[model samples]
Target: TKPALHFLDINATEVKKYPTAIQDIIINRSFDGMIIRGVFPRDTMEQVARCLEEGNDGGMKSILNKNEEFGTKVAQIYGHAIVGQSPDLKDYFASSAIFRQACRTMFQGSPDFEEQVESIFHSLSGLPVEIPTGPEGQTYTPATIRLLLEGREIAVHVGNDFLLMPAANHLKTLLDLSDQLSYFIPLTVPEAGGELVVYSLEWNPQEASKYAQMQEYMDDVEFKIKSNQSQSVAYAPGPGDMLLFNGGRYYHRVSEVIGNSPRRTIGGFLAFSKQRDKIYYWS
Candidate 1:
C-alpha cells in the first residue's frame, strides 16, 4: 500500500486568521505541500512579469552542466542557483552578489520584497527565517527567477545537493542541513501544464546508480508515474500563489509547460539549521 499524500490549500491573506496552529499541521509530514493562494499583494505578480519580460540585467543564462550531474538544460535562471554549477567558494561569493543585484533589479518597485518573503516563511516555519551569509560575509541567493520556456519541463528529482554537489562543501562549514523544502511564488503562469507533481516515493541513493546503469532509465521513471504505479498529487498554482513542499524526501517534478509564455517563478530552498533554531534560505 502507498502512503497517504496531502496538500493544504489556503489563501495567504487568511493564514493569520486560521483556526489552528499554522506551522504544526502543514509543515509536518502529514502534508505533502502547502499552496498559499495569492502569496503576493495585488498587482505584484504583474509588475514582476513585466520586468522580467523587458529586463535582462541579471545575466539570464542557461544553467551550467560540465558534468551532467544536473541532467539537462531544462530551464534558464535570472540569478545563480548553486544547483547546476560547481563553483568554488570565491565564485559562489562573486555570483551571489549578482544574485542580490538581480533581486533588487527585478523587484525594484517592491521595497518590502525581502520582508514579504520573510513574513510568508515565518508564518510557515513558526520561527524566525533569514537569508544567511557565509563565513566571509557573502550573502546567499535568497531566491532565483526560474524561467521554464514552453515545451520544457523539470524532471523528477530530489534535493540531495549536500551530497551531489562539490560546492556544498562550503555549505557544510556554514550550517548543517538534513532536509530541504522548496518554496516558489509564481510570477507568470503558463497557458497549460507546469503543474507540481509530487509522488509517494522518497529518495533512494541506490536508484542513482541504477539510473546511470540502466538504458532508457528516464522512460522507466516516467512510466511509473504515468502508469499510476505510484500515488501522486498534481498541483497547478496560479500567478502570485506561494507553494511549499518537501522536495528533499518526496520525488517531485514540474510538468512540461505548454504555452508561449514561460513558466516564470521566483523561489529557492529552505532548510532548518543543525540546531533547528533558524531557517536558512538559498537558491
Candidate 2:
C-alpha cells in the first residue's frame, strides 16, 4: 500500500506562509501531495458559484471520448472551458465552432470570473503570471469547470495539463516540459462523497511498456481499486476552499459524487517558464 499524504489547514489570511510551506513539501520533502484548506473567503466562492450558474444552464457537454471503453466506464459529467487555447488543442478549439462560441459565452455570463481566479493564483504563487498567446496570436487563459451530478465521478488518472513534443536530448528535456501545478476551488459540494484523492505513485517514463499494458486494462476497476491500496489519501473540501497540488507528479482522481445534490468547481493548471521565472495557467 501507499504512505500517508500531508494535509495543512491554513487560513486564507496567511497567504504569505505558503511559499516556504509549499516549497518544503514539494522540493525538499518530496511528498506525494499537499492539501491546504480555506485558501479563499467563503463569500468569494459563493459569488463565483452564482456567476458560473448563469451560462452553465444546458451549456455543458461531455469532454470525454466515447470510443475508448475506459471513457465509458466513468460516470457522465459536464464541462465548459471559459478560455482555453493551445497548439496541442487545435483540433478541439479550431475544428469545433460550437466550442469556440461556448468559450465566449462563459466570459459573457461571468465577466469578473477571470479576474477573481487570477487573483487567487497570484496570491498563492507570489509571482506575477502571464497569459500566453495561442496559435492565433491571442493571449488565452483557460478557466474551466467539472460538473458532476449525483452518482457521477471522475475516475483515477494522471495528467500533464499540457502536451509536449517528443524529447530529443537532455537539453530538450530540460527546456521542454516544465513543472505543472494545479488548483481546485469548489463552488458547490454535494451532500456526500466527491473527495479529491491523490496517489503516491510518480510517473516513470522508463516504465513505458508496463504502462502500455496497464492502459489495456484501465477500465478494470478491480485492478485499479486494488492498486490504490498503498499510499492514498482523500480530501473533502468545503465550498470556497482551495486545494493546490503538484499534479504532474501525483496521480489523482475525484471520488464518486453521491446524493441528489450536484458538485461544481472552478479549476485550472499552472506552468512555469523554463526560460524565465514566469508562470502561466490554463484549464
Candidate 3:
C-alpha cells in the first residue's frame, strides 16, 4: 500500500535499522535498537552543479537563486509545516550560522572536515535518555546549536528520546555527487509483503476537529502522491534512504508493527558542524 518511513527489506527479510518510526508529543519514544533512513535532497548535488557551472564565485547560491521558482515552491511546502516560525530567506541566507557551517564544511572544505563537522553536530544535538535534575528540579530537554559556516546555523530539537534537525549542506553534497555516482540511498521494505504506509499527524493543531480533518487530508494526499501514475515510485527505500517530514507542523511517524516485530534498528544524528562555535559563541 504505502512505504514504511523507517526500515528496509534485505534478501526478502525486513531489517529495521538506520530508521525506526519517530514522532513528537509522545513520552519515552526513543529506543536505541531502531535504525532510521533519511536524505539531504535539497542541499546536495543540485547546489554543487550550480557551483561548478557558475563557479565558486557565488557557489550554491547561484543554483539556488536561478531556480527561484522551484526554490520558492520548496520553501512554501516546507514553511507550511514549520512549527513556530519559518526562517526568512534573507535571514537564512545572510547570518544563519547553520548556513555558514554548510559553506565552510560542505562547500569549501575537505571530506575530513565534513566528516568531523557532521560528527560534532550530531554529538552536540544528541539527546540523553536520563536527564540530570537541577537544583529546582525542573526537567528540561537538551538543546544544541551548530554553526558550520560564517552565517549558517543549525538548531536541533532534542526531545527526551529523539532529535529532529534540518539537513542543509550535507544533502547538497550528496545531490551534487549523485550524477557521477549513486550517492542517494535506496528504499527497502522492513519485511517482505509489509506495506509502505506514509502518514502524518498534527502535534499541535488549532483544534481537535481541525487536526482530525487535517490528518484525513494528510492520509489522502499521501495516498494520491504515492499511488499517482506520474509517481513511477520505486518499490521501497533501502537502509540509506531517508524520508523527512515537517517536524514543526505535522507529527510524522511510521505505523506500528505487526505481530512480534523485533524493532531492532540503528539511530544517529546529522547537523551543520561545530567549528563555527567560535564564531557564534565568541562573537
Candidate 4:
C-alpha cells in the first residue's frame, strides 16, 4: 500500500503572513506536518552533536533505558533527554536546569542554532513563541537531543499529551491539550535506515485507556494498526532539515539505524495556548 503523508514546505526564516499556519494543521487538519529546510548549516549541526557527546553523561537513563520507576529495559536509543528515564513532570523539572545548560553550552560555538530554532517556530506559527513555563512556574527545557546508534530504533507510538498526568499537572492551563506536535532538526543521519515513519492512523482519543504493563500497551498499539493496515509516510531528513509533524495524534517511529554513522536530532513538542493566542514549546 502506498503511504499517504501530506505536509508543507517552507524556509526556516520564512515568517508566515498569517498566524494560521499551525492552526490550520492541528486545528483544521490541513496537513500532516511541515518541513523547514536548512534550519542550520551542516557544520553547525555537527558541532552541536559533538558537544552532546562531550558534555554529557552515560546515556543510560534516557528513553528505552532502565530506570528507577520503570526498571530495566532494552537499550536501543540514548542521549540526555530532558525527561530522564522515568519521564514524569517532577523528574522533568528537576533536570530542567541541567538540560537547559547543556543546550546553551552545546549551542555555544554553533552558528544560528538558538536563534534559528526560535525563529522557525515563531515564523511558522506566526505567534509569540517561547519555551514557556510549567504550572509551577519552573522554566521548561526548550528541547532535548536524541541519539540513535546502529541497530537502535524508536518503537512505534503516539505522542499524546497524557504524560502530563498527575505529574505535569502539565501545561493544561497554558496550552490547548487536544494534541501535540514534534519538531526536530537532524544534525546527523545514519548511513542507512533511521527514517521517521508516520502512519495515517491518528490515535483515537475516545478509545484511550491506561496500561498496567509496557508490553501490554505496545501490543495493543500494534493490534490497532495491524487491524486497519494504515498507510504511512517516511522521511529520511538530511542534516539541517527541520521536520515537524502531528505526533500526538499519529503513530510514528524511527526505523532501525544501520551501518556506522549514528543519527542525532534536537527537538520537542509545541502547542497553542489555551486562549489560542500564544504558543509554548518544550522537551
Total clashing pairs for each candidate:
0, 4, 52, 0
Judge candidate 1 at residue 167 and give its lDDT.
71
Model 1: pairs clashing at backbone N, Cα or C within 3 Å: none
Q: In candidate 3, which residue ranges exceed 4 Å CA deviation?
A: 1-189, 193-196, 209-235, 256-263, 268-283
Q: lDDT tens digits, residues 1-283, model 1?
A: 7558777888888766543233343345666668888767548778767765776545433222223254443666665677755646666567677767666666664645677878877766666788878776778778877778777788787776345677776666545546677889888889998888888776766765676554456567667777756888888888878888878778789988898878888898877776766778888
Which number leads on TM-score?
1
Over 4 Å off, model 4: 1-4, 13-19, 54-90, 109-112, 161-164, 208-217, 223-228
**lDDT tens digits, residues 1-283, model 2?**
6446665666666666665443444445554344556655667666655645664623444342222353422533233232223325443443234433444554454434456556655665566666545455543335556667676677766555234322112222222264466677787899998888777665545554455576554544235445745466778888767787777666678877789777887676666657535556655
RMSD of 3: 20.8
- lDDT by residue for model 4 over 190-217, one digit each (tens)? 9998888888777764444577665776
Task: For residue 231, give model 2's deviation from the true position in Å.
Answer: 0.8
Ranking by TM-score: 1, 4, 2, 3
| Predictions: Cα RMSD each | 3.7, 5.5, 20.8, 4.3
Error at 16, model 2, angstroms = 0.8
Give the Å shift of residue 9 in candidate 4. Answer: 3.0
Model 2 pairs whose backbones collide: 1-230, 2-230, 2-231, 3-231
What 10-residue stretch in candidate 3 is worst by lDDT?
174-183
What TM value does model 2 have?
A: 0.71
Full-model lDDT, candidate 2: 0.56
Candidate that beats the other on lDDT, 1 or 2, i.e. the better one: 1
